[PDB]
Structure formats: structure tokens, C-alpha cells
Amino acid sequence: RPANHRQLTFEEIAKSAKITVNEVELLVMKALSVGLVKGSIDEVDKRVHMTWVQPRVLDLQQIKGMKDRLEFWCTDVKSMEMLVEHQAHDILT
Amino acid sequence: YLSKIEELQLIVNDKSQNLRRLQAQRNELNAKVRLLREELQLLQEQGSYVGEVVRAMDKKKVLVKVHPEGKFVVDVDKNIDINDV
Amino acid sequence: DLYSRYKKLQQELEFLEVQEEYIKDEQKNLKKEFLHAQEEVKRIQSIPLVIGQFLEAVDQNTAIVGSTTGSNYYVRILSTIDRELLKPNASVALHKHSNALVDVLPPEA
Amino acid sequence: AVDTAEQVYISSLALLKMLKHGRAGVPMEVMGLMLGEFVDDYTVRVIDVFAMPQSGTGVSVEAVDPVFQAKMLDMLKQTGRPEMVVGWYHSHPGFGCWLSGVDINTQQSFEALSERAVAVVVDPIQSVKGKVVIDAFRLINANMMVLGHEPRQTTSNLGHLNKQALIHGLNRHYYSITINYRKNELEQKMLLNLHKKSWMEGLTLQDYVVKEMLELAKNYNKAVEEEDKMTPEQLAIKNVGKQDPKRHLEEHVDVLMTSNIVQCLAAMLDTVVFK
Amino acid sequence: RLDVFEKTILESNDVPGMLAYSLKLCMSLMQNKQFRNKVLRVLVKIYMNLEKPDFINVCQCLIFLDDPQAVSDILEKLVKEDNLLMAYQICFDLYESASQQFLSSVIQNLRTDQTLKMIKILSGEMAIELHLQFLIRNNNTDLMILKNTKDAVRNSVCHTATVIANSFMHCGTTSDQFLRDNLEWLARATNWAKFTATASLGVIHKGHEKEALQLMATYLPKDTSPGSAYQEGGGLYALGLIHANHGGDIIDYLLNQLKNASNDIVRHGGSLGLGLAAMGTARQDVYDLLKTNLYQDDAVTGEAAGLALGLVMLGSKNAQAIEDMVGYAQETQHEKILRGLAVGIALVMYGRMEEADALIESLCRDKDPILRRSGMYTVAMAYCGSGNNKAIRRLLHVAVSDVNDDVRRAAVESLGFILFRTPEQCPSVVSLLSESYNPHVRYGAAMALGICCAGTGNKEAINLLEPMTNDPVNYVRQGALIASALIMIQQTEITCPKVNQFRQLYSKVINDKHDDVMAKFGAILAQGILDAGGHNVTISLQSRTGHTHMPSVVGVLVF
Amino acid sequence: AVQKVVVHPLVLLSVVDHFNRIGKVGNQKRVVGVLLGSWQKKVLDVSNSFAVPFDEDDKDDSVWFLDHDYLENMYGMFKKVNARERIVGWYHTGPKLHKNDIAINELMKRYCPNSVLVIIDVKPKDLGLPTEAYISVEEVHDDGTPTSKTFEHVTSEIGAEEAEEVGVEHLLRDIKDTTSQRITNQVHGLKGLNSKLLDIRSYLEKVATGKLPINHQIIYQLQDVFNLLPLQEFVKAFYLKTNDQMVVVYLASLIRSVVALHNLINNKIANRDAEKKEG
Numbered sequence A: 001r002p003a004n005h006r007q008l009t010f011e012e013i014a015k016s017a018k019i020t021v022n023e024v025e026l027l028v029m030k031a032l033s034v035g036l037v038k039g040s041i042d043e044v045d046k047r048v049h050m051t052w053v054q055p056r057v058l059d060l061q062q063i064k065g066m067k068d069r070l071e072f073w074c075t076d077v078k079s080m081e082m083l084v085e086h087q088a089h090d091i092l093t
Numbered sequence B: 001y002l003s004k005i006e007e008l009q010l011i012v013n014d015k016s017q018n019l020r021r022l023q024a025q026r027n028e029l030n031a032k033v034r035l036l037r038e039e040l041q042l043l044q045e046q047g048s049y050v051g052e053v054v055r056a057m058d059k060k061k062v063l064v065k066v067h068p069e070g071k072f073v074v075d076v077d078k079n080i081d082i083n084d085v
Numbered sequence C: 001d002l003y004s005r006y007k008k009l010q011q012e013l014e015f016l017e018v019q020e021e022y023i024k025d026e027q028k029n030l031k032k033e034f035l036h037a038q039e040e041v042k043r044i045q046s047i048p049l050v051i052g053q054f055l056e057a058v059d060q061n062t063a064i065v066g067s068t069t070g071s072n073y074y075v076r077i078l079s080t081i082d083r084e085l086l087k088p089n090a091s092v093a094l095h096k097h098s099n100a101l102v103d104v105l106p107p108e109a
Numbered sequence D: 001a002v003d004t005a006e007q008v009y010i011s012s013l014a015l016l017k018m019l020k021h022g023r024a025g026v027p028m029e030v031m032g033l034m035l036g037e038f039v040d041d042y043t044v045r046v047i048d049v050f051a052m053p054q055s056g057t058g059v060s061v062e063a064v065d066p067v068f069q070a071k072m073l074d075m076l077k078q079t080g081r082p083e084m085v086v087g088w089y090h091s092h093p094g095f096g097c098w099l100s101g102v103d104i105n106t107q108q109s110f111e112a113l114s115e116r117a118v119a120v121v122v123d124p125i126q127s128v129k130g131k132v133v134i135d136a137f138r139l140i141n142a143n144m145m146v147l148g149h150e151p152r153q154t155t156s157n158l159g160h161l162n163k164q165a166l167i168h169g170l171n172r173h174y175y176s177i178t179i180n181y182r183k184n185e186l187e188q189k190m191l192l193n194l195h196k197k198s199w200m201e202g203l204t205l206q207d208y209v210v211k212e213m214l215e216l217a218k219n220y221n222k223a224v225e226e227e228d229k230m231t232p233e234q235l236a237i238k239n240v241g242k243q244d245p246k247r248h249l250e251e252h253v254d255v256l257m258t259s260n261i262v263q264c265l266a267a268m269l270d271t272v273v274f275k
Numbered sequence E: 001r002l003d004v005f006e007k008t009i010l011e012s013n014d015v016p017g018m019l020a021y022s023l024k025l026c027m028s029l030m031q032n033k034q035f036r037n038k039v040l041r042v043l044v045k046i047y048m049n050l051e052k053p054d055f056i057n058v059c060q061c062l063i064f065l066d067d068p069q070a071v072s073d074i075l076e077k078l079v080k081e082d083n084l085l086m087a088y089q090i091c092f093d094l095y096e097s098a099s100q101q102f103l104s105s106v107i108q109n110l111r112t113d114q115t116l117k118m119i120k121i122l123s124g125e126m127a128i129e130l131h132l133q134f135l136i137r138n139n140n141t142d143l144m145i146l147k148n149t150k151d152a153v154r155n156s157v158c159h160t161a162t163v164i165a166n167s168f169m170h171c172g173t174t175s176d177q178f179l180r181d182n183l184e185w186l187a188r189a190t191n192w193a194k195f196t197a198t199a200s201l202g203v204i205h206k207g208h209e210k211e212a213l214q215l216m217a218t219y220l221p222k223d224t225s226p227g228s229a230y231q232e233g234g235g236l237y238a239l240g241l242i243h244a245n246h247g248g249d250i251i252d253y254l255l256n257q258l259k260n261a262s263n264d265i266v267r268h269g270g271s272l273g274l275g276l277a278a279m280g281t282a283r284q285d286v287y288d289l290l291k292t293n294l295y296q297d298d299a300v301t302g303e304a305a306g307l308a309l310g311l312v313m314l315g316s317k318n319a320q321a322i323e324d325m326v327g328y329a330q331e332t333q334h335e336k337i338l339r340g341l342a343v344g345i346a347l348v349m350y351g352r353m354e355e356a357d358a359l360i361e362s363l364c365r366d367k368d369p370i371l372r373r374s375g376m377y378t379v380a381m382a383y384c385g386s387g388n389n390k391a392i393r394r395l396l397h398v399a400v401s402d403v404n405d406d407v408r409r410a411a412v413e414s415l416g417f418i419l420f421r422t423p424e425q426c427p428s429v430v431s432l433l434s435e436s437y438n439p440h441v442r443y444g445a446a447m448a449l450g451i452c453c454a455g456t457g458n459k460e461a462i463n464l465l466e467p468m469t470n471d472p473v474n475y476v477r478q479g480a481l482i483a484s485a486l487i488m489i490q491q492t493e494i495t496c497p498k499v500n501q502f503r504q505l506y507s508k509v510i511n512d513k514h515d516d517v518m519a520k521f522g523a524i525l526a527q528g529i530l531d532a533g534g535h536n537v538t539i540s541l542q543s544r545t546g547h548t549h550m551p552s553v554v555g556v557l558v559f
Numbered sequence F: 001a002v003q004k005v006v007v008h009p010l011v012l013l014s015v016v017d018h019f020n021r022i023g024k025v026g027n028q029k030r031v032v033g034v035l036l037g038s039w040q041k042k043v044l045d046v047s048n049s050f051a052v053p054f055d056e057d058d059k060d061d062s063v064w065f066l067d068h069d070y071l072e073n074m075y076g077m078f079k080k081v082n083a084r085e086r087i088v089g090w091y092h093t094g095p096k097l098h099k100n101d102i103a104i105n106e107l108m109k110r111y112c113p114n115s116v117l118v119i120i121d122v123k124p125k126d127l128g129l130p131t132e133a134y135i136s137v138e139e140v141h142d143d144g145t146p147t148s149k150t151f152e153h154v155t156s157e158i159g160a161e162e163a164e165e166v167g168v169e170h171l172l173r174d175i176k177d178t179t180s181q182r183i184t185n186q187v188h189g190l191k192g193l194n195s196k197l198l199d200i201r202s203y204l205e206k207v208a209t210g211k212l213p214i215n216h217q218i219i220y221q222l223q224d225v226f227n228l229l230p231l232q233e234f235v236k237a238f239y240l241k242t243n244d245q246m247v248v249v250y251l252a253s254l255i256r257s258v259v260a261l262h263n264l265i266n267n268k269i270a271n272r273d274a275e276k277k278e279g
């Protein structure tokens, strides 16, 4: 999931990770010892928060279909660069 | 009357030409202040010191007490008279 | 002549407006040049500021000033200095060779 | 009859060599031999300048080193350009950098060896940006006293040239020649392209510093404007009391402009770059 | 649109001379070449529709509408109607104010008693030789000034502007006075005083066409016997001076002198002379041998090649002079050769008024202030009067915003050529130009005062130049000198009270020995121009006929 | 290991004039010569160097000619001139590479323990910075084959060791101290954008015809530093920026109202003075 709700609830963890509520904390403190993900996990809602991670090895279908992020970035930061410059166009001066 | 009013009023709009006269004054001031700033190359070579002069004399000469030195009759300029010293 | 004199009123206003235009781009150009000047005002200087001392002024921003090297001199000064500040024999500062006064410092020693 | 309004086609690279060696040589003066071409009469061209051995010398003529020049020329022939030496180079980084005695010896000791070998002197210490302090002269000898000397075969070159203590006290034997830089676009292109591209944030995607800078900026802004703001209290010159208005109310605004300008710039670049 | 126009030129009774001054007034508010020639060819035909025929209409439409066949038709009316005494307008305006290219084409179209006076008006030598008679009979010298300026002769302007002085006083006196009075003052000759000491004979002998060769009997090209070719080259240049616009075979004889297997020792002056001689005639042979003069790779004759080739290709629109002179421009290893080619490719396109825009944009496209300076000369010659803002906006942009002052100088020389028509507004714009920060452009503003306000009765220009000679730059003081000489041509003391002030004041500042001789460089020349003719003659940049006089324009801009 | 060297434009001009040399003497195309330098630290200076008379055969790029009389011999004459800028490396023109670069640099490795080759630019047309340096590297693989020596991007930048612009500045005749932001903005944008376009085309090649380096060693962690912000939901940063723009507009408002008052007072003073006290 690239999307947000990076303050994930513990629920998918305790369902699909074959772990319990008393051991999600060890599940991510042992990962703090590992050092590939360092979440700021919520503990008033018990939510397992997502910070930066070590992503994958290969997604060749997403190495091809990363255009929806790469070309997204390219043409959209390009277009909004053209828009900022186009609103400040004739102070080229 | 029919087609004879607007350009007279256009020459009236040469108050904008008077605005150009004002900006002309402006750029005059600026160009000549910058000329003043250009003058400053003179300020790189010699802040000529005060040489004392015992007295004047003819042959366009004086008795200059070269202050950190002795007296050595030396040259003059072509601006002031001999008696002026 | 409504079909001559009146019409002739534009025979020169075109160049009029063209020069009124060009005064603006030349304001721009002269501003460039003035910025260049202000740049060159103080970029070589104020690093090896030698110290003498003021002694006497003759004309605008020009003064005979006691040295600390062994030879008092009558040099010109940076005009922007407040004219009511060159009165004392305070810590003036000039270039080594040019001996061009840049500013005077109150304290010393 | 070389009496003309003459010219020298310098090579900026040789200028770089001269500044390179005199800039940080011994406190004394340096001197060497040119490498260019006596291309014409009313002008001349220069391309190359070698560095000189460090033998204890000066503006003396007899500073010749045979094997040095031999190997240098042999390597240059093995290199791209086997062009002939036509003069000499030299500097005066120490003193007031003018055509001293041994110059008024070597320039004739070699201008007979050479044909012109126009002077080359420069003092790097006298300027870094302000002046271009350098010297160059075609020596005159006591034989040219035949007629009234006004070469000026063209004008406004020796005319614009109308614009040195002992050397203007030595205009005899020392008449200066109009100089110029080469049409350097061949490199001037790469002399600005690489410069502008780098000297301006290189990649330029870097500050696009933006807070700690304006903190101190606005922080000192609240401390700076409150003195120039005392000038209207001094502009309390009501009846007749005002000389120059202490026209220093500026020199802070433009800075304030730049400050909040960049503030808005970065505010933009945030939402612009970030997505 | 010519519907109400045709109903109101075939209209009813007023003075028909309404339409006669309306010719010049339509020309005063004219913007295009599109109904200019239309109205210009239909008003002459509505004068052919009105029963009273007119001659001022053809006096104007020959020099604005360039029809060599309608003048042949009404010149058969001059042979048939037989009145030579009414014929003066068309005949000697055809001699006076016609383009030399149009002169050759019109003597081509015309020949198909006035049976031989039809050829005698086109050669028109009568006014030439009685003008020469005036130039020998009338005189008013000031020789004391000639001695007190003779005290500061060098390889300099004194050696040239003494003969410029008494030769603009006397264009063809056919008499020696500076040859006669001395030889040792004449013995300060070194290559340009040598070039001048043999070219000055034809300087002082403008006109006087037949006795050119037999007056330079001493100056045939083996009869100098000098250890230098300039003392024999300026003489053939002086033949080129005499043989201006009316040669015969001697154009081809200077051509053959260049082609008597002689490289760049005869060409030294003879190539300048040949290009000056066949000017605007659009020859072929001079282009053929000036191509190897162009490819000499020596600018002492190469600038003569570029200048002389522009001279012989005046306003050409050639497909090979323009392209084959812009081609050699880039890969040459000098740029005074580019000054030569610069003024040459300026002169190759004169007055086209919309055509040369590709060339101006192509050359001001480039980065070279010398080549952009060439572009400004070329836009001074393609545009003169036509302030359509196409030749003003970007002209003024590059004129005053640019970084090198020489192209800026050529642009403020272009201003005086595009502002000839109404010099009323020209003080109000060039006094603004005065405010410049830089030496060449201070001087060029002075030159804009000079060549712009030549014939004017302005006092504000004098008021401008007085602080301009109160200026530490010496040659802007000479700009004040020479430009005020150009404001003191044609006019006397009753015109403005600064005339005799400056007349004695220039000798007064030449009394000061410690001035630069660059400060008084053209002071002898300011005295000479100050009596150009002795106020007998004047500039002709825009003739009283209505049409510009292009060899005078050539003279001033190469001058 | 070098993060930067003094890329002194004097050696740039040397390179340029000897490229003019290799162009005018004939058809020798790839400008290649010896880079000289003084190893002060990881940082270094490149102000002096030279081109060596060398030729590369069309096939078998491992063809080169490095005269000892034009290098080793010259080095001794240059040793008496200045021993500092020692033999440090070399360079080559041509955008990507040829096959010999590695063998050349390893031959000269005896001279400089960290010898460098530099892809030199003969035509400044770049978006950014010209020629960069590549020192000896041992970077084979996770496979860890016999150590490849394709010299990695040993970063550096245009070091101007000394000003010496007494002439250099005297050459520009074009620019001022640009008190320009818009220039920076357009450059930065378009450069990021064309870079990303090169990226997407390279990766479309990877999917299509790209080799095993399709995701070689970092291209995935390339995407991870992209994954720094992987709408990014900067809502924390949204109200953060809300207070930030509170600060921004406080700055704008206060400072620019000050500016208003500032010009107002004295500009109007001078205005009214020269206006009514003139008449």
C-alpha cells in the first residue's frame, strides 16, 4: 500500500503476522534492533505506526509501472514549474 | 470637430512626455553620480603629502622643507604665481 | 487644415513615445551601472587597512593626516564619511600605497 | 619604419601563466621568453608562454638556459604547436612594477636578437579585481632621432591610447603599444558556460538557508531598522535646520525586500517541489 | 482607396495646385510603398487628364516613381513641342537629383537643338564647368590661421586639413598655392602624409574633368620616382577623386592600372580611386578583380577592396555581392578588414526600406560589436527617414543599452540619417542623448548633433556643444569642434551670434600649446569645414528637389 | 576516495586549447592527456595538467602512446618549476567512454597511487557542471567477480583555488552581483524534469531491453530515497506549514508595511518640496 493511514492499527499485524497484542511491541522493538524500519508506534490507540522502511528487492512490473510516480513527478512538477513561472511570467524583466 | 479632437488631446498627453522629462532629470542625476563614482580611480595612486617651504624664489623654485627629509629645491605647478608661495 | 495639421500631429509623436520608452530601459541600464559602481566601491578595500591619524583637512573629503609610518600625507577620504567626524586625530584607516582614507576609528592603544 | 599605431594579439592563457607564476613566486620579479608569432607590423600575436627555471636571475639579458629551451621546443614540436619564439615575458611582483634598469638592458640586448620582443611586466600584488596591473612596451633606441616622432599611422588607437612615475619619466625609449585580448569565444564560451552553471548552485536544485537565515535576518531586521528609524527624529529639522537628510533610510529596505522575497520563493518551492 | 480619391482629383474648380502641394503632403503622411506609388502615378495622370499639363509632377515622380519610359515619352514631347525653356524642370532635375543607376537606365531608355541637347542635359557638364568657374573666381582666405595651425603639423590632420580647407573652399581651383609656398612643410611625408602629399592634388582638383590626366602628367604611374609606392598610389587615388560619377574610359583605365599585373602597390590608392570612380554604376570587371583584392588576405588593400566594392555596388541587391561579401566577413583574422567590409556591405544596400531587415537581423544577431556596428551602418543606409519603429525600437535598444561603445557610436550616427526630415524634434532627443556616461558615445552624440543638424539654424546645439568642449575627454572637445563646424556651415553671424565667437575661439584654443593635438586634431578641419566653400557650398543629404542625394550621404558616412 | 578537487579553470583553458590543437592538427578525435595534482587530503587541486601526444586506434581502444620524454622527462623539468602538482591522473574526451580508460589509468597507477581519469567536455552545453573525475575503484558485485575497475563517479566541483580574476573577471564583461531567483527556479525545475525523463526512458529500456543492472544495486534504494515521501499526506506538515505561513505572512506584512511607510514619508517629502517650493 503506497497510500496513507501510516498510523496503522495493530489488527492486520495480529491477524496475518501470527502475533498477539502483548507482542507487537516486541515485534517492532526487535525491528528497532534490526534497523530497517523505525516506526513511532501509537500506544493510546495501540496503532502500529509506519515510518520509513527498507522497501523490496525487485518489482519489475513496478519498475515498468512506476511511470505513475516517475512520469507523474516529471510532468507534474514540470507543469507546476511552468505554472509558477507562468504566473510570474512577465517579470522576466 | 468630427475627426479633429483626439490627437490634440494626444499632444495633451505629452504630459507623459513631461514624465519622460522627469525621468530624464532622474537619469541625469544617476549618470552623473555614477560619474562621481567613476572619478575614484584617482584615489588609488597618491594622496600627496604636505611639503614645507622655507620660502619662494624665481626660476619657478622654492626652498621646500621635505618634512621627513632635508630641503631640496624641486619643481612646481603652472597654476599659482611665484610670489604666492 | 483638419485633413493635414490635425493629422500631422502624429508625424512626430511616434518618435516621441519611442524615446519616452527608451528612457525606461536606459533607467534600467544606468541602474545596472550604478549597482556596478556601488559594488566596486568597497570590494578590494578594508582588508589591509593601514592606520595613520587625521591632522588637518583642506577641501572636501581631503585632509592632511598624520601617519604612523613616518610620513604625514594630504590625502583624499571616502566622501560618504560624515563630514563632522574627521575633526579628531583618531584612528583613521587608509590603503597602504594609495593612502586613501576609508574611515576613522575612535579608540586605540 | 615600424612607427605605427600598433597592436598585440595576446593569449589569455599566457596571461594565466603569468599570474600563476608571479602571483606566488619569490617576492622578487620573474622573467622569461615569449612563444608567439611576429604575425604583422602594425600588430603582433601571442599564443604560448612556458614557465621559467628558477636560476637566480632578474631582468638581466644573460639568463639564457640552453638545454631548457631545447627540450621545451622539442616537446612542443612533439606536441601540437611547433611555432617559433618571438619575444620574452617577465613580471615585477615586488616593487612599483615598471621598466627597470636591466629591462632597459635586456630589451635592447634581445630586440636585436629578436625584432621587437615587446616588454612584458606585471605585478600581481597591485590588484586582484580593481586594476589589471601589467606592463608592455616597445623600446626605442637613440637611432630613430631622424625626424619628428609622431607615428600615428592610424588615429584614435594612439588617440584613445593617450589616456608611470619613472617610466612616464622614461617615455623616451618607452612608447606604449595599444593592447587587446583575443577573440576568446572559442573558450570564452566554456569560460562562462561552466562558470555560470557551477558558480550558481551548480545543479541549482539545492536551495529549492530558508529559515535560520531569515530568523537572524528578521531578528537583526527588528534591531537594524530601529536606528535608521531615529533619522526622522533627526529629520525633525522643522524651521530651517536641514542639511543633507542623512540619506541612509535606504540600505535596509532592499535587504528586507530580498529577505521576504526569498521567504515567499521558498514558500512556493515547498508546495511546488514537494509534489 | 482610390474611389473618392479619383472623384476628388477629377473634381471641380479650385486651384489644381492643391494637388501639387498635396503631392509633398501625401508624401509627408505616407507610411508605405503601396499606395505611395499609386497616388504618385495617378496624380501625374490626373494632371495628364486636366488640360493644363504639369512639370513639377514629373520632376517629383522621376525621383520617387522611377519611370525611365514616361520621361522618354514626354521627352519626345520635349523634342516635338520643342520648348527647351519650359523643359528645364524635367531636364536638369533629371541631371540634378537622379540616381546614377537610374541615370544609366534613363539614358538607355531616352535615346530611342534638343537632338543633341537630350544627351547634353544628361552629361550636364555645363553646370559642372561654370560651377568650377565659380570655384576659381570666388575666394576669401585666412592664411594667418593657416600659419598658426601650420606650427603644429605632424603625420596628422594639419597636413591633410590645410588642403581640405582650401579645397573645400576650392573644389578644383586648378592652381597651386600650398605646393608653391613651401617644400619643407611639404617634406614631413611618411606614408600617409606621403599618400596625402600625392592625393592632395586631386583633393584640390575636384571636377575639371578633361585636364585630370594632363594635369597629373607628373603623376602617371611611373613618374613619381620615389622609394615608396604610397607617393605614387595616392596619385591614382587622386585620379579616382577627379573621375567621380563621370568617367568614360578612365574608369576602365584605373581598372587596367590595377590590372597591369600590379599587386598592392598601385592598389594602395588606385583601388580606393577606382571604387570611388565607378560608384553605383554596378560594374562587373571591378567586382571580378576586387574578388581577388578581397582575397588578398592583406587589409591595407583589403579594406580598399571592401569599401570600393560597396561603392561600386551601391544599393545593389545583388545575389552575389551581398552573400559573397558577408561570406568573407566571418573567417578573416582581422576586424579593420571588417571595418572595410562593414561600410562596404552597408553601402551595398541603400534605402530598400523593408528589404534589408533579414540582413540587419542576421548581423545584429551576431555578437561582434564591429559586425553589429556594420549592421547599424547598414540600417542607417537601408533606413533614412522611415521611422516605422521597425528601424527605431530595436535600433534604440542596441543603440543605448549595449555594452560596447563603437556599435553605439554607429547607431547614433544612424540617428542623424533617420532624422533628417524634421530636425525640430532632434534637439529634444539628442540633448537627451548628451547625458551619456562614456567617451565614444559622448562623441557620437556630438556627431549626431553634427550630421543630423547640418543645415539647421539651431542655437541649442551650440549650447549643447559648449560644455562638450568643456569636457576632459579631448576628442569630445574635437567633437564639439567638428560638429560646431557642421552647425556653422551655410550660415553667417546674423544667423547666430556664436559663429565668429567659435571662429576666433578655435584659433584661441590652438594658441594654447599644452592642449592635446588630439584636442585640436580637427581644429584645422573645423576651420576648413567652417569655410566649406567659404559658405559658398553646403551639404546635400536631402536636396531641395524632394529626393535625397546619395553620394553626399556616402561622403558623410564614410567620412 | 575524493569528495572534491580544485577544478581551476586555468587547466580548463589548457584542455580547451589542446582540444583546439587535436582538432586543427588533423583528425585525432578523443582529447586525452595527463592530469597533474597535489594530494593535500581527500581534497585536491587541479590547476596544472597537460595533454600527452596519444592516438587511439578505431578498434581495440586499448591503443595509446605515452612518450616518457614528453611525460617522465617533462616531469623533471616541471619538478624544478613546481613539485607540488604531481602526476595525479589523466582525462579523456568523448561522452561515455572507450575500452582503454581502465588500462590507461592502471598503467599510470604506478605514478599516482590514486590516479584519475576525467571525461572532459569539449562543448559546454550541459544543464549543469562540466567534466568530472573518476578514481580507481574496487566495486565488483555481490557476485564479487574479479575486481572490475570501471572508475566510479568520484565527485568533485569547480574549485577556484585563488581568485586570479585580475584578468578572469576582466574577461566576463557580462554579469553583475545578481541581487536571478527566477533563473535558478527555471533551471532547477527543467533540470529535475529532464533528469526524470532520462530516468523514465532508461527504466522503460530496463523493462524492454535493459540488462541485469535493471535494478542493479541501488536503483531500488534510488526508489527508496524517492520513498522518503512515498498525496504523501503531509497533514502534520500541513498545519506545520500553516504556522510556518503565519510566520511568513507576519514577515511579509510587518516588513513590507514598514517598506511602505519608509518610501512614503521621505519620497513624499522630496516630492512636495520640489513640487511646490519650486513655484
Ligand SMILES: [Zn+2]
Pocket (backbone or CB within 6 Å): D028, D029, D030, D031, D058, D059, D090, D091, D092, D093
Ligand atoms: Zn621583473
